[PDB]
Amino acid sequence: LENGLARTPPMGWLAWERFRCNVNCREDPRQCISEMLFMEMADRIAEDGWRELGYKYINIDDCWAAKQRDAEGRLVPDPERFPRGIKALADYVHARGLKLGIYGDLGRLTCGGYPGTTLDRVEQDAQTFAEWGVDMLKLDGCYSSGKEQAQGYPQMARALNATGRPIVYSCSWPAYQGGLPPKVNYTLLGEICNLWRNYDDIQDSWDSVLSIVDWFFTNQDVLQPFAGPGHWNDPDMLIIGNFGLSYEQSRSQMALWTIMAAPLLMSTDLRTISPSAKKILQNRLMIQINQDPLGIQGRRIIKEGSHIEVFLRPLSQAASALVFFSRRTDMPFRYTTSLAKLGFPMGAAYEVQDVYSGKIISGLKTGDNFTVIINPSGVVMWYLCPKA
Amino acid sequence: LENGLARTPPMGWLAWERFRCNVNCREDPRQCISEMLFMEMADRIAEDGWRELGYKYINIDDCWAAKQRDAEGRLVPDPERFPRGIKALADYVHARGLKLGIYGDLGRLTCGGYPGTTLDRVEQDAQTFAEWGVDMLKLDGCYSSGKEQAQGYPQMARALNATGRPIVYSCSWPAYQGGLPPKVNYTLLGEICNLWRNYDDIQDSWDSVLSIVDWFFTNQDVLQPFAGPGHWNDPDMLIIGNFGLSYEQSRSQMALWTIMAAPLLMSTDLRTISPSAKKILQNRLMIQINQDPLGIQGRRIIKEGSHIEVFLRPLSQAASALVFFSRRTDMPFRYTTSLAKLGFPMGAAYEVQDVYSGKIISGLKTGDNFTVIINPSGVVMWYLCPKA
Ligand SMILES: *[C@@H]1O[C@H](CO)[C@@H](O[C@@H]2O[C@H](CO)[C@@H](O)[C@H](O)[C@H]2NC(C)=O)[C@H](O)[C@H]1NC(C)=O
Ligand SMILES: *[C@@H]1O[C@H](CO)[C@@H](O[C@@H]2O[C@H](CO)[C@@H](O)[C@H](O)[C@H]2NC(C)=O)[C@H](O)[C@H]1NC(C)=O
Ligand SMILES: CC(=O)N[C@@H]1[C@@H](O)[C@@H](O)[C@@H](CO)O[C@@H]1O
Ligand SMILES: CC(=O)N[C@@H]1[C@@H](O)[C@@H](O)[C@@H](CO)O[C@@H]1O
Ligand SMILES: *[C@@H]1O[C@H](CO)[C@@H](O)[C@H](O)[C@H]1NC(C)=O
Numbered sequence: 001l002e003n004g005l006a007r008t009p010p011m012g013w014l015a016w017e018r019f020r021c022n023v024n025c026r027e028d029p030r031q032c033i034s035e036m037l038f039m040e041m042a043d044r045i046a047e048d049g050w051r052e053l054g055y056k057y058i059n060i061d062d063c064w065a066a067k068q069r070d071a072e073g074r075l076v077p078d079p080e081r082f083p084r085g086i087k088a089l090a091d092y093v094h095a096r097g098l099k100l101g102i103y104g105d106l107g108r109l110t111c112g113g114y115p116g117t118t119l120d121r122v123e124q125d126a127q128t129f130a131e132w133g134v135d136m137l138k139l140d141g142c143y144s145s146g147k148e149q150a151q152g153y154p155q156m157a158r159a160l161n162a163t164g165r166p167i168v169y170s171c172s173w174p175a176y177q178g179g180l181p182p183k184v185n186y187t188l189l190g191e192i193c194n195l196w197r198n199y200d201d202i203q204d205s206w207d208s209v210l211s212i213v214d215w216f217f218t219n220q221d222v223l224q225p226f227a228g229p230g231h232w233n234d235p236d237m238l239i240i241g242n243f244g245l246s247y248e249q250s251r252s253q254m255a256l257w258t259i260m261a262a263p264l265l266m267s268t269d270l271r272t273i274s275p276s277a278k279k280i281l282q283n284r285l286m287i288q289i290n291q292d293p294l295g296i297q298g299r300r301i302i303k304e305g306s307h308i309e310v311f312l313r314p315l316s317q318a319a320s321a322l323v324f325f326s327r328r329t330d331m332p333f334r335y336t337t338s339l340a341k342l343g344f345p346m347g348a349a350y351e352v353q354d355v356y357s358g359k360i361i362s363g364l365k366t367g368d369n370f371t372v373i374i375n376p377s378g379v380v381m382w383y384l385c386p387k388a
Numbered sequence: 389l390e391n392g393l394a395r396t397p398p399m400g401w402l403a404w405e406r407f408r409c410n411v412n413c414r415e416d417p418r419q420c421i422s423e424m425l426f427m428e429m430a431d432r433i434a435e436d437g438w439r440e441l442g443y444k445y446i447n448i449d450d451c452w453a454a455k456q457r458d459a460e461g462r463l464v465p466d467p468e469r470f471p472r473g474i475k476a477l478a479d480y481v482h483a484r485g486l487k488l489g490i491y492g493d494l495g496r497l498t499c500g501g502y503p504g505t506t507l508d509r510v511e512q513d514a515q516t517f518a519e520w521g522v523d524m525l526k527l528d529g530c531y532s533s534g535k536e537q538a539q540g541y542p543q544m545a546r547a548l549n550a551t552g553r554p555i556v557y558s559c560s561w562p563a564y565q566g567g568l569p570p571k572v573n574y575t576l577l578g579e580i581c582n583l584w585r586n587y588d589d590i591q592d593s594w595d596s597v598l599s600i601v602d603w604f605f606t607n608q609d610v611l612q613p614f615a616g617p618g619h620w621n622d623p624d625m626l627i628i629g630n631f632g633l634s635y636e637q638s639r640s641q642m643a644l645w646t647i648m649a650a651p652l653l654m655s656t657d658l659r660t661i662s663p664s665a666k667k668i669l670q671n672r673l674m675i676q677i678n679q680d681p682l683g684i685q686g687r688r689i690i691k692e693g694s695h696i697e698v699f700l701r702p703l704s705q706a707a708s709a710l711v712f713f714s715r716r717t718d719m720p721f722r723y724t725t726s727l728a729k730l731g732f733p734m735g736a737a738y739e740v741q742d743v744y745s746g747k748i749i750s751g752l753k754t755g756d757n758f759t760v761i762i763n764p765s766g767v768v769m770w771y772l773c774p775k776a
């Protein structure tokens with residue numbers, strides 16, 4: 001989508017995976033979906049170093065609105081959970097130099113049972129969001145037919161533009177259509193959306209992450225070519241800092257999402273996040289690679305019988321990123337190979353930096369053998385710069 | 389096995405899961421299987437508070453011996469990796485008030501390719517181990533037929549007794565025979581072994597733990613009745629502190645192994661263990677419940693459609709232990725029920741202590757509703773004492 005936005009994958013926080021549709025603010029004041037949740041996450045992003053790293057979006061997901069539109073047919077937030085309205089929430093977030101994202105559903109109902117954005121409501125809702133000061137909109141697709149979606153998604157892109165307010169547009173259209181051609185036309189998506197959810201919702205478990213990793217890389221031929229500045233593939237939220245991932249697994253998700261040029265939308269409680277989880281999510285070099293200006297999504301290039309997978313992502317400044325991933329469940333594994341074997345130019349030399357450890361290799365020749373030790377369900381990630 | 393040993397499930401450290409058959413001491417001085425590994429783990433157990441809690445066994449697993457017996461037909465440790473011999477290692481461990489465990493295989497070869505204990509070598513090997521000062525022996529079953537195992541396992545029990553040295557005897561016999569009756573006779577196992585590996589080796593992943601949990605509880609009817617002081621079911625090593633389990637998952641394994649009256653044999657690097665992992669493994673109340681004098685293995689009593697499972701273990705002093713386990717992957721879950729609904733006596737009251745948080749409930753009436761909040765892949769564990 002050529003609206004000057006999302007020239008790099010969107011970075012921020014999104015409520016869904018971690019908080020879901022919790023409306024029990026009486027017993028879960030901090031974990032329930034309310035204006036307070038977003039204001040506090042905004043303070044967290046603004047105060048704990050996240051903002052400086054690039055994390056700027058504070059996104060509201062499903063279950064924020066009243067169970068019905070007002071009499072005028074407009075969407076309104078839940079009165080008890082959002083007593084100051086959305087515009088006020090936006091100002092608050094804006095005052096911190098952050099941006100506010102909201103959620104809607106192209107259909108009769110949102111997946112959670114809240115007011116849906118039917119075709120006759122698209123222009124009005126887009127208008128309502130802009131007036132509130134919204135900066136990003138995720139449009140879900142429950143309760144709408146393929147025909148209705150084919151009309152509605154492009155229609156909402158036009159409506160958003162008409163408001164004159166630049167709004168990042170995240171589309172779930174592909175996921176509802178199976179995520180693959182011919183049913184999905186990624187060329188069209190690139191023209192109308194800034195990013196799109198291609199596949200299943202991420203759940204809080206390592207197997208969920210693996211399921212997403214495997215679907216995207218198995219189908220990379222029909223997905224990788226359509227990602228770029230202004231239009232990204234979205235494998236869903238980062239679940240680092242939550243309940244299901246071990247330390248190694250957490251680093252694995254961050255590394256693989258970076259290879260995929262995926263949005264870095266955290267869905268975790270920033271008020272209780274652990275130091276190790278924070279350290280992973282705040283890795284500057286990792287973020288630099290994810291945010292690379294060229295926006296060329298990487299690919300899996302090797303699947304060893306040793307249960308080791310290798311990924312490569314081409315970058316700006318003639319650089320590259322490599323991820324060595326172990327799916328073994330026995331012990332740290334010694335993977336030995338050479339850049340030449342991985343496909344790099346002959347007779348060259350590279351300065352290599354281990355993204356997580358910081359260790360550097362001054363001048364690795366492409367013909368030289370090297371060994372990396374990868375832990376179970378973990379990765380070793382390299383940033384490579386050619387010497388001249 | 390009535391040898392006065394293992395009146396409570398064995399507690400200690402075992403090398404296998406974490407270190408496997410690593411013999412590359414040149415590049416992995418600390419992680420390779422050598423006398424140094426065991427001496428250092430012994431120092432760890434003796435110095436970091438483990439010994440006082442009950443952890444006393446330091447067990448050697450596969451890959452410790454020379455590739456062949458000496459000329460006299462006796463087992464000898466690998467010369468380079470165990471330069472001071474086993475007896476010296478035992479003395480060292482003994483000097484710390486700990487005990488040394490060793491590994492052997494009833495067959496032509498150990499699963500790792502090391503010298504096996506064939507039938508004609510049983511008496512000699514049992515003799516060799518006693519002389520070295522061995523305190524525990526795990527007898528694997530690779531490369532032996534069912535007929536040979538039926539003869540060898542009982543035969544080794546007799547050989548060990550004859551040495552006059554009390555030796556905990558861990559038998560893998562059932563695992564090789566499928567772990568279920570009629571092929572396996574757990575009454576016989578109770579007579580000849582102190583503990584037995586009934587099922588598959590644990591690997592470093594949550595799915596491995598779940599696979600073990602599900603097999604044991606699905607088949608609890610033919611397993612639970614045969615566990616007791618002196619003879620236990622062994623679901624394998626604790627992998628808390630390693631690469632594949634998240635924090636919640638780690639607590640889940642500890643809690644479920646405690647419900648199963650399982651041996652608490654840690655297989656992790658005690659030199660680098662995290663504070664949180666250490667805190668889980670050193671939980672005194674948890675250990676007290678695992679070590680309960682009655683030795684009555686618990687059972688799964690409920691499988692909700694909410695993906696919540698409930699476990700109960702009867703204890704001494706008319707007490708009980710309950711585990712509420714969530715296999716959901718969405719968010720913390722509120723499980724509401726009553727002790728009456730769980731099956732407890734009517735019109736009674738209990739003092740309840742949350743094993744992990746320490747929070748206490750003074751006098752919970754069996755008829756009163758209560759709610760516990762369980763995190764994804766996590767547990768809530770209670771210790772209950774009746775009031776009078
Ligand atoms: C509506 O669409 C127009 C283009 O159709 C957007 O204008 C483009 O903005 C980008 C970045 O600001 C420029 O690089 C292009 O040159 C512009 N194109 C044209 C035709 O001028 C405009 O930003 C959109 N409006 C909103 C609010 O999204
Ligand atoms: C060999 O077996 C005998 C029993 O057959 C063991 O002796 C028993 O030891 C326990 C605990 O010390 C006592 O409770 C029993 O009363 C003993 N039984 C008998 C018949 O005396 C003996 O400990 C075993 N020897 C070894 C080295 O394991
Ligand atoms: C593909 C897609 O957008 N899925 C969304 C999910 O992310 C979340 O927003 C949920 C809220 O109910 O609704 C849909 O399942
Ligand atoms: C059931 C059983 O004992 N399995 C063992 C395993 O625990 C480990 O000792 C390994 C060493 O090679 O051998 C067997 O697979
Ligand atoms: C996909 O959409 C683009 C953009 O509208 C269009 O040019 C192209 O023809 C479509 N492809 C197919 C197979 O319909």
Ligand SMILES: *[C@@H]1O[C@H](CO)[C@@H](O)[C@H](O)[C@H]1NC(C)=O
Pocket residue numbers: 336337369
């Ligand atoms: C490099 O390592 C590979 C093993 O992956 C080996 O086959 C090859 O012979 C090595 N090359 C040299 C020059 O040692």
Ligand SMILES: *[C@@H]1O[C@H](CO)[C@@H](O)[C@H](O)[C@H]1NC(C)=O
Pocket residue numbers: 573575576579
């Ligand atoms: C199981 O072993 C015990 C102990 O030797 C024996 O008494 C019993 O008969 C055996 N059960 C069967 C079915 O063979």
Ligand SMILES: *[C@@H]1O[C@H](CO)[C@@H](O)[C@H](O)[C@H]1NC(C)=O
Pocket residue numbers: 724725757
């Ligand atoms: C106790 O909670 C259950 C829900 O599990 C509910 O059905 C029941 O009515 C409650 N009992 C009382 C007295 O509130």
